[PDB]
Amino acid sequence: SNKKTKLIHGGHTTDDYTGAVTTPIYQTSTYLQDDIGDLRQRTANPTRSSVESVIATLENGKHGFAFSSGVAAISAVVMLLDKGDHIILNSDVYGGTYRALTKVFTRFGIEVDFVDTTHTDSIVQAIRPTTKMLFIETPSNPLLRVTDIKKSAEIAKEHGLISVVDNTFMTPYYQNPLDLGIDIVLHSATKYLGGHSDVVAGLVATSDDKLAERLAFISNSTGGILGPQDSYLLVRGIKTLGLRMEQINRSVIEIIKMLQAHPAVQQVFHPSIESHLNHDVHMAQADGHTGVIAFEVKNTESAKQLIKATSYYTLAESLGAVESLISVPALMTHASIPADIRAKEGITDGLVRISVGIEDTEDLVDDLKQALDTL
Amino acid sequence: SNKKTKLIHGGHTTDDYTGAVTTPIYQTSTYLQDDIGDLRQRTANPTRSSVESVIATLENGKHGFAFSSGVAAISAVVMLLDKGDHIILNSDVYGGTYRALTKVFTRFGIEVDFVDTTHTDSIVQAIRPTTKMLFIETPSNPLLRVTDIKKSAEIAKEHGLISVVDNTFMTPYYQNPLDLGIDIVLHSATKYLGGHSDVVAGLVATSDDKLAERLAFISNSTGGILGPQDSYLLVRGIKTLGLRMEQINRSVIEIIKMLQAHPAVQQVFHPSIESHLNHDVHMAQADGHTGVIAFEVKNTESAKQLIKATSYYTLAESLGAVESLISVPALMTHASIPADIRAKEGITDGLVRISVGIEDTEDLVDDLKQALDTL
Amino acid sequence: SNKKTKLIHGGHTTDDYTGAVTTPIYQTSTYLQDDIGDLRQRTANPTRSSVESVIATLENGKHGFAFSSGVAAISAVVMLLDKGDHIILNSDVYGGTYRALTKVFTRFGIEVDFVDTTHTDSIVQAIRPTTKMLFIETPSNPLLRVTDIKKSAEIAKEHGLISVVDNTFMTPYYQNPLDLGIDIVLHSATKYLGGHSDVVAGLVATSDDKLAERLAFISNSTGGILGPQDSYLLVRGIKTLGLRMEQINRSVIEIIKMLQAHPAVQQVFHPSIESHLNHDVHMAQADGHTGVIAFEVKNTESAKQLIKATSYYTLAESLGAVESLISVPALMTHASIPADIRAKEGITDGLVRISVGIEDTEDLVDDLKQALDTL
Amino acid sequence: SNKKTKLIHGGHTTDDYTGAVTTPIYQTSTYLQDDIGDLRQRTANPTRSSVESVIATLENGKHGFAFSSGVAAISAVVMLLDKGDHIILNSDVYGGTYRALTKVFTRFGIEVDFVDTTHTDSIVQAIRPTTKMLFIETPSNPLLRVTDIKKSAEIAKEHGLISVVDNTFMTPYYQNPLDLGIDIVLHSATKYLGGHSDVVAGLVATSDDKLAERLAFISNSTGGILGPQDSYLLVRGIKTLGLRMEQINRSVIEIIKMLQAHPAVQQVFHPSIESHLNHDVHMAQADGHTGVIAFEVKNTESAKQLIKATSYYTLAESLGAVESLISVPALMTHASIPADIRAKEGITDGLVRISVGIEDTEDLVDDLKQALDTL
Ligand SMILES: Cc1ncc(COP(=O)(O)O)c(C=O)c1O
Ligand SMILES: Cc1ncc(COP(=O)(O)O)c(C=O)c1O
Ligand SMILES: Cc1ncc(COP(=O)(O)O)c(C=O)c1O
Ligand SMILES: Cc1ncc(COP(=O)(O)O)c(C=O)c1O
Ligand code: NA
Ligand code: NA
Ligand code: NA
Ligand code: NA
């Protein structure tokens, strides 16, 4: 079956006991056991189990894990290491992952090595004898740099590293790292998967039995589990993922065409443009596009004016909503970095990031263009 | 005002916007900001804020924190330390706290020193130059050993330790560690606070501004946050905490009287008995009792028969429900420990643990006694 | 078993499939059937079924029904009649029941006869050949008039009437009409049963198989069903009903003692006072008291001052909350009735109604008395 | 703006107080009032208000109403009449509407006249002096007969009738009766609007201030209101209505092409076929199609075999799910009607009804065709 079908019929989301076509919400903390032997030494919440089954199915994995946030998911995966271990990350990682690793886990002796992974040979140069993990976001934020997933998986296997992909921006609908050799795939399900700005959740999938066993142990020992109500809403939201991503992709193509032609717009960052670095790699490992786009207007006041002029783009920092969202990295996500290092990494003052939602394509193109025309 | 009043009117649990007498459930992930300056670099979920306000109020603290489990709360507090730091714990700690510390955080170089804290001088002997934290459960599980909270707080202040009390078994209704000098108090809110076996949650309260700031940073960086629906149910459940604890206490006194007189029952463990170690300390730091009781029947088959004979005690491993619960530590929580070390620590094969619920006192006394009479 | 036990273990509120100790929330609209014969021509939502089971158990009935409001429950019971049929009600009925009957169902040719049922002979005088139903609130609002339930049941059986009691003010914890011969008992579960001001619901119980069949048909044909989430919260709230009612009753006795002695207070209305009409009847059909009390201060400005002076009584129109509530009938529920008819029925301008909550008894007595002292 | 945009930004679904991008769930029953004058004599639940705002916006009405079921919505609209009043309905009405009217409201003296409304002159012939309402489903179930909405609105205005359209099968996305002169439009929101088989709800919209006032009075007097949790899930589901309906429509066109060409298939009923009665009317009042299709196989055992052979069509009686559904009217919805009257109205034994879901178009076409090929 094709993907839109698998979104509806894959996983276990019905109730075997009653035939209910949606999975019951087990708002409970305790399950009675028939006899005392069954209580050897979290007991699986069936609503959470349902969402773990969905994420394992959509990523062609064997094991799914649901955390109370994407940060809790990343944090759990990093706790697969010990003090003294090294992890390689793509060097434009920022936000939650960066803050967790550099302000929490370095205090536990986990060492972080940042690497431009757009060239996989950089990974090979960075490998030390203490390196245990390779962690890759692709495409990355906010400039959407693309990393060769298959080659990174090969390097990781050859050097004995656990390979991890943050697949939030692509979703399982367009890119399946486990199919390319990666050990663990994870998501901030808060974004496209939930899809409605109303669930904070992280999701992790793997095919490795032993990695899954260690993840289950970490989860049950540190306790960052997703609740049953949020698990329910996550499964619900994932039902329309294909339709939403396809609408978003149609709008993405049209919007990019408009931006590349507009006078007030300079550089445009998105893996669909041929001139974009590793465009061929992206087409080879994905069969669609993210809804995050970055582009340069002339300066900060042009950016702020763009925000104020748009009727349908909403000022906010998240992504993957049904509403289209707009932000200025240099004033929001990266305002802490000093201006010159920002400039030197690409985060010019006129950089704008949009997250395409599911409004009508013509409305989003026309709104953004009338806003740009006011410059 | 007295306590039952404070349970109803303390904290902020109403809606200022509409006048709603219960706190709205903010099933959302994003809040729109009026202008771009407000988005400097989790945004406070108002339902979670409401429950944090309640726990801070009930413990006479200044700051509350809600985690997706009691294990996530403990785990967050332990992440206040770095590799090389030492934490002292009471030596009969087991279950989630023990597993987290000895199987997760020792891998990050956090060293654990177990100490019989029923004698505070043992704490003073155990203090090393690397010791940073003193973590105390009182009363402990399953034998309900009592530790002098005030004296432990004094030792911790004098030696520069963060002092932490796990106050799950007493609840804020009967024992307030922050009032005795402790820095951080925490709870598995899954138990008495929620009170209905339908929420998995952890709660942490403090008066220390700087500790609160570090806890907020850890929370926002590792992401083990409680969801809005569970936050709601937790506040709801806390409304009846006084009535439930008082019923449980009435039944506890009657049940203990029955056990101390029964032929088939040998030792009884509960801090209300005069002969119990540190009974005077407990009366000095608490004004009521936990609903957990342990007692010895003759052997394992007597224990299993007791379980089978009771109409109103349910076999399960948790505690603090509206239902009364029954368990046998040596076959359940402590079955992994070899039999002779069990015996040597008190976990005889005939040890039974009950959690008194809110059924009618006469029914619980009579049911347990008719069961014991079948021995 | 005693009542507090039955509140915890009566009904079916666990999950047979998984052993979950709380009943799952079936947020679903459809159940798959194995083969096409099972789909003969609402399908029972198992969460709603659980709450219907609880209300049937607590009232010693055979059949329970959950509606989206107490008004929907009353409205469904009235639809047991046809145009031309007559129903007798106690004559101080007002609010939702009165509005429904006199502004909706008289338009369908259902005739209403109001009768002072404090004298059951008035019922017998009012019986016509078209009379089909006898509908009784006891105690009534806001003056708490008491009707002899057993005698009314006898009259109804002898004359072929369906007898209905609105048992909201007493709850199943204190008064069981089905045990006294009544055909149908109903509740605004919004009040004491839910108990937390967060569920709008109606509940109906019966032992009559044929009446139950007609109620099920009316329910499935008009569709005023309670949702699964509210059903869940209702069962949850009913768990603590005994503890809450007992606290409320303790405070009720103390508060009445204070009111009967205070200078600024004239008449006091509550069925516990010996001089209250039918006090002996009430003691004979109930084994506790409602938490609604009415009393007279001197005039409207004394009433408003009382409201403003109380720290713990909250101005609102509902009842059965964990918070104590205060209201002035003549300005709120009965402001529409002209002043002289109000006066003539008992609704003097200084009449105050309070609903006792579960705060500390001493706090509620002292707060109300300090407020009264400011007069 | 175009429709997909209006689905996202129309109505009030954000929180003004906090900026939350989704509407808070007000799980509450009571709102505190600042001073006693505000409590003159249901108070608007803001979650329900949000969904009423959405349905009013999507139908270009002024007033929205949410009921606990579509049956409760119909039932409320019918209670706009008195005993002796007559309502005209399209004559193939069945199921909930028919059962409500003929088994409940005729007992209240409301008279029902069934009329083939595919010819509006039949309406004019049926008008009596007691007629007060014209109630039309279009397209109808299960044969999808089409009624001229605009002409029916003209007849109703000219003769002083309240005109009502059941717009469930089309949704507001494709057909807007209020724009064609109709007084009241309603929906079983359980179907396409919620869209996920997890909400039971009815929705009613109007532009008439006085009709809205009477509906509000009926609602508040009979109490069939939608709960806050279901209101929330309904708004959530309506977010993707455009994407879902458009997918369903693409599959509908392809599936019909397959059915019209298949040997084992005889008649096909859907308003998109040119030869279908009133196809021109439907194109004139709607700009898309319903996902319900009916078609004839040869006999009952062919129908049952079709059901068993399909991988992606699920046996169930509802419609508007994300899953495609299959049913046989003569064995399910219409099994009660005697076989010969069934045959005489079109409900042959080989009639199959499908509800197209949002699976991949190719999968649904191919699955249904391979099933038909097994005949
Ligand atoms: C790398 C990264 N992951 C995750 C998040 C937030 O996701 P969640 O809300 O699910 O924790 C952020 C936000 O800044 C982020 O930068
Ligand atoms: C010390 C300790 N804390 C907490 C828990 C479980 O609490 P929660 O379910 O809230 O994580 C356990 C269970 O074994 C435990 O032993
Ligand atoms: C007789 C009666 N029943 C019920 C209610 C309200 O109960 P509910 O909110 O459950 O419909 C009222 C409110 O005025 C009332 O007067
Ligand atoms: C005419 C009609 N309306 C509504 C329904 C069911 O809708 P709901 O579940 O929202 O009451 C049915 C089911 O048979 C029906 O026939
Ligand atoms: Na692999
Ligand atoms: Na202190
Ligand atoms: Na009877
Ligand atoms: Na009009």
mmCIF file with all atom_site columns, C-alpha atoms and ligand atoms in Angstrom, chain C residues 67-74 93-99 135 137 141 166 168 186-191 199-202 317-318 333, chain D residues 29 41-42 220 222-223 225, ligand 3:
data_model
loop_
_atom_site.group_PDB
_atom_site.id
_atom_site.type_symbol
_atom_site.label_atom_id
_atom_site.label_alt_id
_atom_site.label_comp_id
_atom_site.label_asym_id
_atom_site.label_entity_id
_atom_site.label_seq_id
_atom_site.pdbx_PDB_ins_code
_atom_site.Cartn_x
_atom_site.Cartn_y
_atom_site.Cartn_z
_atom_site.occupancy
_atom_site.B_iso_or_equiv
_atom_site.pdbx_formal_charge
_atom_site.auth_seq_id
_atom_site.auth_comp_id
_atom_site.auth_asym_id
_atom_site.auth_atom_id
_atom_site.pdbx_PDB_model_num
ATOM   1  C CA . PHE C 1 67  ? -27.237 12.772 30.382 1.00 0.00 ? 67  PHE C CA 1
ATOM   2  C CA . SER C 1 68  ? -25.317 15.866 29.346 1.00 0.00 ? 68  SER C CA 1
ATOM   3  C CA . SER C 1 69  ? -27.009 17.852 32.164 1.00 0.00 ? 69  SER C CA 1
ATOM   4  C CA . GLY C 1 70  ? -29.503 17.434 34.954 1.00 0.00 ? 70  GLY C CA 1
ATOM   5  C CA . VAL C 1 71  ? -31.923 19.375 32.786 1.00 0.00 ? 71  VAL C CA 1
ATOM   6  C CA . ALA C 1 72  ? -31.431 16.803 30.029 1.00 0.00 ? 72  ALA C CA 1
ATOM   7  C CA . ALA C 1 73  ? -32.190 14.049 32.555 1.00 0.00 ? 73  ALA C CA 1
ATOM   8  C CA . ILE C 1 74  ? -35.417 15.677 33.758 1.00 0.00 ? 74  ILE C CA 1
ATOM   9  C CA . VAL C 1 93  ? -40.125 23.741 42.266 1.00 0.00 ? 93  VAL C CA 1
ATOM   10 C CA . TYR C 1 94  ? -38.289 26.441 40.316 1.00 0.00 ? 94  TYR C CA 1
ATOM   11 C CA . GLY C 1 95  ? -35.215 26.932 38.150 1.00 0.00 ? 95  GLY C CA 1
ATOM   12 C CA . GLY C 1 96  ? -34.409 24.411 35.450 1.00 0.00 ? 96  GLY C CA 1
ATOM   13 C CA . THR C 1 97  ? -37.208 21.904 36.109 1.00 0.00 ? 97  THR C CA 1
ATOM   14 C CA . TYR C 1 98  ? -39.894 24.594 36.263 1.00 0.00 ? 98  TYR C CA 1
ATOM   15 C CA . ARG C 1 99  ? -38.594 26.409 33.197 1.00 0.00 ? 99  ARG C CA 1
ATOM   16 C CA . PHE C 1 135 ? -42.336 14.304 40.489 1.00 0.00 ? 135 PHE C CA 1
ATOM   17 C CA . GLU C 1 137 ? -37.861 17.217 45.027 1.00 0.00 ? 137 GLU C CA 1
ATOM   18 C CA . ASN C 1 141 ? -34.964 24.722 47.071 1.00 0.00 ? 141 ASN C CA 1
ATOM   19 C CA . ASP C 1 166 ? -34.988 14.518 42.352 1.00 0.00 ? 166 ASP C CA 1
ATOM   20 C CA . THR C 1 168 ? -29.730 15.903 44.090 1.00 0.00 ? 168 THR C CA 1
ATOM   21 C CA . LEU C 1 186 ? -32.493 11.383 39.249 1.00 0.00 ? 186 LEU C CA 1
ATOM   22 C CA . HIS C 1 187 ? -29.684 13.838 39.954 1.00 0.00 ? 187 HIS C CA 1
ATOM   23 C CA . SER C 1 188 ? -27.995 16.914 38.661 1.00 0.00 ? 188 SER C CA 1
ATOM   24 C CA . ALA C 1 189 ? -24.620 15.187 38.940 1.00 0.00 ? 189 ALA C CA 1
ATOM   25 C CA . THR C 1 190 ? -23.097 18.659 38.399 1.00 0.00 ? 190 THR C CA 1
ATOM   26 C CA . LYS C 1 191 ? -23.522 19.164 42.161 1.00 0.00 ? 191 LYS C CA 1
ATOM   27 C CA . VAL C 1 199 ? -18.679 18.429 35.182 1.00 0.00 ? 199 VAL C CA 1
ATOM   28 C CA . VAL C 1 200 ? -22.135 19.224 33.829 1.00 0.00 ? 200 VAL C CA 1
ATOM   29 C CA . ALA C 1 201 ? -24.114 16.006 33.972 1.00 0.00 ? 201 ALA C CA 1
ATOM   30 C CA . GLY C 1 202 ? -27.417 14.377 34.861 1.00 0.00 ? 202 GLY C CA 1
ATOM   31 C CA . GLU C 1 317 ? -25.485 30.209 42.265 1.00 0.00 ? 317 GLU C CA 1
ATOM   32 C CA . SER C 1 318 ? -24.571 26.507 42.161 1.00 0.00 ? 318 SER C CA 1
ATOM   33 C CA . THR C 1 333 ? -32.789 32.740 41.397 1.00 0.00 ? 333 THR C CA 1
ATOM   34 C CA . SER D 1 29  ? -19.252 24.241 35.631 1.00 0.00 ? 29  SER D CA 1
ATOM   35 C CA . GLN D 1 41  ? -32.081 35.241 37.358 1.00 0.00 ? 41  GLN D CA 1
ATOM   36 C CA . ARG D 1 42  ? -25.988 27.683 30.763 1.00 0.00 ? 42  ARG D CA 1
ATOM   37 C CA . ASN D 1 220 ? -30.671 26.045 27.952 1.00 0.00 ? 220 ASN D CA 1
ATOM   38 C CA . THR D 1 222 ? -33.502 20.942 27.689 1.00 0.00 ? 222 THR D CA 1
ATOM   39 C CA . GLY D 1 223 ? -29.748 20.677 28.190 1.00 0.00 ? 223 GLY D CA 1
ATOM   40 C CA . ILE D 1 225 ? -25.100 20.636 25.255 1.00 0.00 ? 225 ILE D CA 1
HETATM 41 C C1 . LIG E 2 .   ? -34.172 22.309 39.016 1.00 0.00 ? 3   LIG E C1 1
HETATM 42 C C2 . LIG E 2 .   ? -32.800 22.504 38.428 1.00 0.00 ? 3   LIG E C2 1
HETATM 43 N N1 . LIG E 2 .   ? -32.143 21.424 37.947 1.00 0.00 ? 3   LIG E N1 1
HETATM 44 C C3 . LIG E 2 .   ? -30.906 21.600 37.430 1.00 0.00 ? 3   LIG E C3 1
HETATM 45 C C4 . LIG E 2 .   ? -30.280 22.849 37.352 1.00 0.00 ? 3   LIG E C4 1
HETATM 46 C C5 . LIG E 2 .   ? -28.906 22.971 36.758 1.00 0.00 ? 3   LIG E C5 1
HETATM 47 O O1 . LIG E 2 .   ? -28.330 21.675 36.736 1.00 0.00 ? 3   LIG E O1 1
HETATM 48 P P1 . LIG E 2 .   ? -27.506 21.269 35.425 1.00 0.00 ? 3   LIG E P1 1
HETATM 49 O O2 . LIG E 2 .   ? -26.428 22.306 35.275 1.00 0.00 ? 3   LIG E O2 1
HETATM 50 O O3 . LIG E 2 .   ? -26.920 19.902 35.655 1.00 0.00 ? 3   LIG E O3 1
HETATM 51 O O4 . LIG E 2 .   ? -28.450 21.292 34.231 1.00 0.00 ? 3   LIG E O4 1
HETATM 52 C C6 . LIG E 2 .   ? -30.971 23.966 37.845 1.00 0.00 ? 3   LIG E C6 1
HETATM 53 C C7 . LIG E 2 .   ? -30.409 25.332 37.809 1.00 0.00 ? 3   LIG E C7 1
HETATM 54 O O5 . LIG E 2 .   ? -31.060 26.357 37.970 1.00 0.00 ? 3   LIG E O5 1
HETATM 55 C C8 . LIG E 2 .   ? -32.234 23.776 38.383 1.00 0.00 ? 3   LIG E C8 1
HETATM 56 O O6 . LIG E 2 .   ? -32.903 24.853 38.861 1.00 0.00 ? 3   LIG E O6 1
#
